[PDB]
Design a protein around this nucleic acid. Structure first.
Ligand SMILES: [K+]
Ligand SMILES: [K+]
Ligand SMILES: [K+]
Ligand SMILES: [K+]
Ligand SMILES: [K+]
Ligand SMILES: [K+]
Ligand SMILES: [K+]
Ligand SMILES: [K+]
Ligand SMILES: [Mg+2]
Ligand SMILES: [Mg+2]
Ligand SMILES: [Mg+2]
Ligand SMILES: [Mg+2]
Ligand SMILES: [Mg+2]
Ligand SMILES: [Mg+2]
Ligand SMILES: [Mg+2]
Ligand SMILES: [Mg+2]
Ligand SMILES: [Mg+2]
Ligand SMILES: [Mg+2]
Ligand SMILES: [Mg+2]
Ligand SMILES: [Mg+2]
Ligand SMILES: [Mg+2]
Ligand SMILES: [Mg+2]
Ligand SMILES: [Mg+2]
Ligand SMILES: [Mg+2]
Ligand SMILES: [Mg+2]
Ligand SMILES: [Mg+2]
Ligand SMILES: [Mg+2]
Ligand SMILES: [Mg+2]
Ligand SMILES: [Mg+2]
Ligand SMILES: [Mg+2]
Ligand SMILES: [Mg+2]
Ligand SMILES: [Mg+2]
Ligand SMILES: [Mg+2]
Ligand SMILES: [Mg+2]
Ligand SMILES: [Mg+2]
Lengths: 61, 141, 261, 48, 184
RNA sequence: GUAGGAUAGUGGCCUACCAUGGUGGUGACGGGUGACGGAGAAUUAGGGUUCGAUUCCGGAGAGGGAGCCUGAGAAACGGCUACCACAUCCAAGGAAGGCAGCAGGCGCGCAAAUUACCCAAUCCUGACACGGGGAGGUAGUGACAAUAAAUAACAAUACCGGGAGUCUGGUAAUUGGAAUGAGUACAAUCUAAAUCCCUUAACGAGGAUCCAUUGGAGGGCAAGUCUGGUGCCAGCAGCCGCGGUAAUUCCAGCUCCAAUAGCGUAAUUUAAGUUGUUGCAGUUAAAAAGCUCGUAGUUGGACUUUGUGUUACUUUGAAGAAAUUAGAGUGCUCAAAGCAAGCCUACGCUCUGUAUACAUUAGCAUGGGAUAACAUUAUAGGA
């Protein structure tokens, strides 16, 4: 106890931060929101959508 | 005496190759007859208890060593497995699954038990040691 | 395999990159380019592991995709671009300019340059032959092809190349008495005077090099790179100046440093 | 041979419960008393 | 492939070849009780470490004294022994490394030095103090009794700033007793 | 061998014609392998023995064969065609199949985990700074293996020793106040998000039940000629042995011993100078062929300078993957490890470090020419 070590980044402006900073570190500081998604569900949608051709690809439930 | 020549490398190497066969330990591992043993090179084996038998202890001892004829599940060979400890034969029933192990002398008979080279470790998935010490009970009844 | 391998396992990467073995399963696979994959330093290593400008693989891409890094005077956006010996790396925003030279321990060192010295580089001539239409040309060991070279230039010579005019400014003939650097093998990074050339018909040619302190070492012709005519190199060398110290001597310096520092 | 006598003696032996007593120290403490009882103060288990 | 598969690990002790030698059992228990060790394993790893150091010295001594490897690694080995207080500046020869014993290494343990510097009443009291986060070597708290102290660090052994014995607040036993006394 | 054909190209690779060659006790050919090769692993005084499916490199395969398209690259199988073997759906007319990818299931067995989360790190790929990645990482299961390390410390009494006396040491579920993490938990931190660790408010020990186990106590071999039971029975016992009515050996209690968060039981190394090159034996213990000849093999006296014949040997050097091994530097709290870090307190520095050795045999290149091998010599085809 009694001492901690970390790493720090100071950006010239918040605009430069949003360009070079990874998304997860922007959510921690509140500069961005979190889009909730399931990777496995996205994969199953991809495989279901490639059995259909044309504009119906999206409407495939 | 020994061949000593600096150019005698082939003869020395081939002589030792032939003579290693005279060693019983060497020949037992390189003959390939271990695969024909009931365990076929394995440390343990499961089997089915065919019958509960007693074997007369070899002289000068006098006793009835409680064993069990077991047929190995993986190759169908029949062996005699000694059941150790006092009254452990009562924990074994015919047509029961038992784990067998060696008797400790690598396929050689042990003690005064004639022609027995295996012992019973488990019965019905439970170790005889646990049953002997009343740690566990056989799964039935 | 049924074709070309696109991955480089981290333990199979060249040792002079000094990559930690537990840093990951993979190392940057050097792209095709002027230098061989085993004798280069990909830009990702330079920007992230040597200069610390980037903290991750992703940040190196951001730096390069802004067109902020140049190699031999041209912007490069390929993360695994194979920058190699004598290449000039320039970063205008930081006003920095480095030359890739080996330190005496055989590893690439980013030798900071002055703005004046960053306008040229040295190249070793691979061969000279006639091209289409009987036009003579020479190619180097950094993948460059120069047409209409000086008739005096021959194989294994060194040429001074201006990165602006892209022309041969001057050249050094390969001969005994010149100062050379070793670019491969055990003696990589060592500088000395070429003392002898032992030719063996059908076999590799051996060259005996003598250090400034009298230490003599041999190597193959393919690992030699002439740096200057006589005894003065045409390029700035790092602090060691190609002088390889014994481990006993190196330990002596370290002990003294702790007493003073 | 006859298998009816298997477990004979172990069944005849009269049961005797173990006497609960204070446990001994563990680890380093155990090696401490074991060290005082052999260097600081007939075999170890003689029937004296 | 898993990257974790490349992490190295090794063994730190070997068991005796003869398990029931009465002479050895007598000598080992004397060192265990003298230095308050947990078991024979702690003594066996010190013997294992000592064997490694002696083996390195023997190989060097078998080479010519002008051999560069003899000179370089010999100096490093002597420098390593001096930095931990095993050898003396007057014993700067590889032959003196071969004369080291287990007691020399057990005397450099943090447990031994906490006791022989007066901080503890017994070698067994030092053991509990170390593991209970009451000791520090310089600025760092050390709770490993096998910590091998260096000569440059022996003079900085003191109680931790967070300990009741080093300026910190009293532990939870005194605090509860104080609370109970106040309630009365 | 010659001439063609085919191939990205060499080549009996294939065709025509011709020749009769090619390999072999220096083991060809054939057979066995529970045989992928290597880097390496275990054990090692030295020499050695054994292992090497598995994360690095090389090769090979995708149920068994064969064939092929596309393409820079495939004889590709998360591509196609056929046969064979299995097997799914069907409205019985057809149709679709390839987990030795990840997870999961069945089976086989002595024998092996979640049908989880994520592209944040490492890197790869595409038109691409952005998409994708069961590669890879994270967590779950996990006593394979490895590291550190609790289960008490101290004082005063009573009791018991040693150096009448009094200092020191040892015991007690006695009596006292102190210490503390296992646990629990605000919090913060950790992380892609969680979780664990580290840090920390509160809480958390007296029979500190917050109860250490696994094997033993005749010998080998550390520890009982204790007590009860059994009576050549039951059982023990790796080996020698114990048990037949006074059991140190069985079944128990007590006590004691060894290791200790571990310990017992069931291929291989050591011990083995019981495979012997170093380094064993052969009068009688196992072992000189009944005797001699004899080819290959193996081994061969002395002599040449002291005061472009061909090789072995020796010296030095070059080239040589990493990881592992040895080893330099470095206080992850120590350690197994890791490849980091250190310095001061500025908009930073030490060009920070990330050494070095080892690496059979064969091959390459210098120096040496003793020892040794082969070749050679008088009509000199000599200089
Ligand atoms: K031999
Ligand atoms: K290939
Ligand atoms: K061809
Ligand atoms: K031909
Ligand atoms: K293509
Ligand atoms: K990623
Ligand atoms: K990308
Ligand atoms: K010897
Ligand atoms: Mg003789
Ligand atoms: Mg592949
Ligand atoms: Mg050539
Ligand atoms: Mg032809
Ligand atoms: Mg023909
Ligand atoms: Mg093999
Ligand atoms: Mg196979
Ligand atoms: Mg392998
Ligand atoms: Mg196999
Ligand atoms: Mg596997
Ligand atoms: Mg592979
Ligand atoms: Mg294939
Ligand atoms: Mg299959
Ligand atoms: Mg195929
Ligand atoms: Mg598949
Ligand atoms: Mg595939
Ligand atoms: Mg398992
Ligand atoms: Mg406990
Ligand atoms: Mg008993
Ligand atoms: Mg004894
Ligand atoms: Mg009795
Ligand atoms: Mg016994
Ligand atoms: Mg033998
Ligand atoms: Mg003998
Ligand atoms: Mg006879
Ligand atoms: Mg005889
Ligand atoms: Mg002679």
């Amino acid at each position: 106890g009694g001492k901690s070590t970390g790493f720090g980044l100071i950006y010239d402006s918040v605009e430069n931060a949003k360009k070079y900073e990874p998304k997860y570190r922007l959510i921690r500081n509140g500069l961005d929101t979190k889009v909730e998604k399931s990777r496995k569900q996205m994969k199953e949608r991809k495989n279901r959508a490639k059995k259909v051709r044309g504009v119906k690809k999206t409407k495939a439930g | 005496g020994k061949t000593r020549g600096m150019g005698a490398g082939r003869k020395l190497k081939s002589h030792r190759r032939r003579q290693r066969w005279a060693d019983k330990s060497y020949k037992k591992s390189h003959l390939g007859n271990e695969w024909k043993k009931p365990f076929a090179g394995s440390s343990h084996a499961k089997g089915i208890v065919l019958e509960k038998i007693g074997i007369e202890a070899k002289q000068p001892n006098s006793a009835i060593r409680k064993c069990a004829r077991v047929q190995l599940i993986k190759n169908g060979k029949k062996i005699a497995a000694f059941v150790p400890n006092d009254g452990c034969l009562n924990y074994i029933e015919e047509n029961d699954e038992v784990l067998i192990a060696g008797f400790g002398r690598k396929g050689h008979a042990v003690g005064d038990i004639p022609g027995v080279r295996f012992k019973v470790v488990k019965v019905s998935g439970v170790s005889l040691l646990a049953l002997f010490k009343e740690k566990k009970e056989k799964p039935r009844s | 395999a049924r074709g070309l391998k696109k991955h480089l396992k981290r333990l199979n990467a060249p040792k002079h990159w000094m990559l930690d073995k537990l840093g990951g399963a993979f190392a940057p696979k050097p792209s095709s380019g002027p230098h061989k994959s085993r004798e280069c330093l990909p830009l990702v290593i330079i920007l992230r592991n040597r200069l610390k400008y980037a903290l991750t693989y992703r940040e190196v891409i951001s730096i390069l995709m802004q067109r902020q890094v140049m190699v031999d005077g041209k912007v490069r956006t390929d993360k695994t671009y194979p920058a190699g010996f004598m290449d000039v790396v320039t970063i205008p925003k930081t006003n920095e300019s480095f030359r890739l030279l080996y330190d005496t321990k055989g590893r690439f060192r980013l030798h900071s340059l002055r703005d004046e010295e960053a306008k040229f580089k040295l190249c070793k001539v691979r061969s000279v032959q006639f091209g289409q239409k009987g036009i003579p040309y020479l190619n180097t060991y950094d993948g460059r092809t120069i047409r209409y070279p000086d008739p005096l230039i021959k194989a294994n010579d060194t040429i001074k190349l201006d990165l602006d005019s892209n022309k041969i400014v001057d050249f050094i003939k390969f001969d005994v008495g010149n100062v050379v650097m070793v670019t491969g093998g055990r003696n990589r990074g060592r500088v000395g005077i070429l003392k002898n050339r032992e030719k063996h018909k059908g076999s590799f040619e051996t060259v005996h090099i003598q250090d400034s302190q009298g230490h003599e070492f041999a190597t193959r012709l393919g690992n030699v790179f002439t740096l200057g005519k006589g005894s003065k190199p045409w390029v700035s060398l790092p602090k060691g100046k190609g002088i390889k110290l014994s481990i006993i001597e190196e330990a002596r310096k370290r002990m003294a440093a702790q007493s003073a520092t | 041979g006859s298998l009816a006598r298997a477990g004979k003696v172990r069944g005849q032996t009269p049961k005797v419960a173990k006497q609960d007593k204070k446990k001994k120290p563990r680890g380093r403490a155990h090696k401490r008393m074991q060290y005082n009882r052999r260097f600081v103060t007939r075999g170890p288990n003689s029937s004296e | 492939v898993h990257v974790s598969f490349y992490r190295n690990y090794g063994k730190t002790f070997k068991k005796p070849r003869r398990p029931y030698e009465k002479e050895r059992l007598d000598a080992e228990l004397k060192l265990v009780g003298e230095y308050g060790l947990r078991c024979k394993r702690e003594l066996w790893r010190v013997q294992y470490a000592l064997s490694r150091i002696r083996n390195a010295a023997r190989m060097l001594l078998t080479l010519d004294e002008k051999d560069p490897r003899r000179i370089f690694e010999g100096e490093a080995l002597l420098r390593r022994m001096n930095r931990y207080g095993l050898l003396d500046e007057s014993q700067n020869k590889l032959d003196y490394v071969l004369a080291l014993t287990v007691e020399n290494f057990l005397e450099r343990r943090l447990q031994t030095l906490v006791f022989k510097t007066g901080m503890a009443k017994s070698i067994h009291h030092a053991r509990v103090l170390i593991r209970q986060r009451h000791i520090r070597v310089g600025r760092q708290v050390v709770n490993v009794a096998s910590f091998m102290v260096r000569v440059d660090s022996q003079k900085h052994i003191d109680f931790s700033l967070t300990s009741p014995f080093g300026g910190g607040r009293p532990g939870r036993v005194k605090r509860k007793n104080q609370k109970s006394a106040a309630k009365k």
